[PDB]
């Protein structure tokens, strides 16, 4: 037996009026735990406030989208729980309006496009971004961090930011987004859905 210990542990989150914000959070223990997002010790769930769950539920994104101010700016809380016990982690959430973004705040020059791409063709979508210090780029598809390194080699991060995707197939269709971080804050690219198509024939 063992009680619940979080494996990751959510960021805080500087974003800017009008974007996204997400917060992850993921635990282990014996049994395996649920993870559950609060504020205040309150249920988070609205129309702008989604949790997306993973892993059986040991894992949770919370997403905020449209972020407003100063309304959301506020301390949210990730509830670990099984028989042996319950923790909770915390993170903070502070939204920037347009007009207040310091100079290195993270800019998206450049967001990826919708992709339309023929099954088991190669399929590229870039992001390119700017910022002080230099933004380190992440994906997310269908509101869930994308981890190429757990990907098999099916996906990979190009060094200049773009996402790549191998071999396309079904499975690869969705919702991407773009996200450039660094200690100014985060920033959101506007989505990009991937479509994967026949080729064309004669008849
Ligand atoms: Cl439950």
Same mark, same amino acid.
């Given at each position: 037996?063992? %009680? ?6 959510? $960021?805080?989150?500087?974003? $800017?009026? *009008?974007? $996204? ?8 223990? +014996?049994?395996? %735990?649920? =993870? /559950? ?13 989604? /949790? ?6 040991? *894992?949770? =994104?919370?997403? @905020?989208?449209?972020?407003? &101010? ?8 990730? $509830?670990?729980?099984? #028989? ?26 450049? *967001? #990826? ?6 099954? &088991?063709? /190669? ?10 210090? +230099? ?9 869930? %961090?994308? +981890? ?16 790549? @995707?191998?071999?396309?197939?079904? &499975?690869?269709? *969705? ?29």
């Amino acid at each position: 037996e063992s %009680p619940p210990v979080f494996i990751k542990k959510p $960021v805080d989150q500087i974003g $800017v009026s *009008g974007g $996204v914000a997400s917060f992850v959070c993921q635990a282990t223990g +014996d049994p395996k %735990p649920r =993870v /559950t997002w609060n504020k205040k010790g309150k249920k988070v769930n609205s129309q702008r406030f989604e /949790t997306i769950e993973f892993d059986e539920s040991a *894992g949770a =994104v919370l997403r @905020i989208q449209p972020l407003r &101010t100063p309304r959301d700016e506020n301390i949210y809380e990730c $509830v670990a729980q099984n #028989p042996h016990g319950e923790v909770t982690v915390h993170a903070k959430l502070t939204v920037l309006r347009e007009d207040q973004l310091p100079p290195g705040f993270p800019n998206i020059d450049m *967001g #990826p496009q919708l992709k339309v791409v023929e099954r &088991t063709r /190669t399929a590229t979508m870039l992001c390119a971004a700017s910022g002080n210090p +230099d933004p380190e780029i992440t994906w997310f598809k269908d509101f869930l %961090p994308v +981890d190429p390194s757990t990907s098999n080699g099916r996906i990979k991060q190009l060094r200049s930011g773009g996402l790549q @995707i191998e071999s396309s197939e079904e &499975t690869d269709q *969705g919702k991407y987004e773009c996200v450039a971080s660094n200690s100014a804050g985060v920033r959101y690219s506007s989505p990009a859905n991937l479509y994967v198509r026949v080729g064309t024939k004669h008849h």
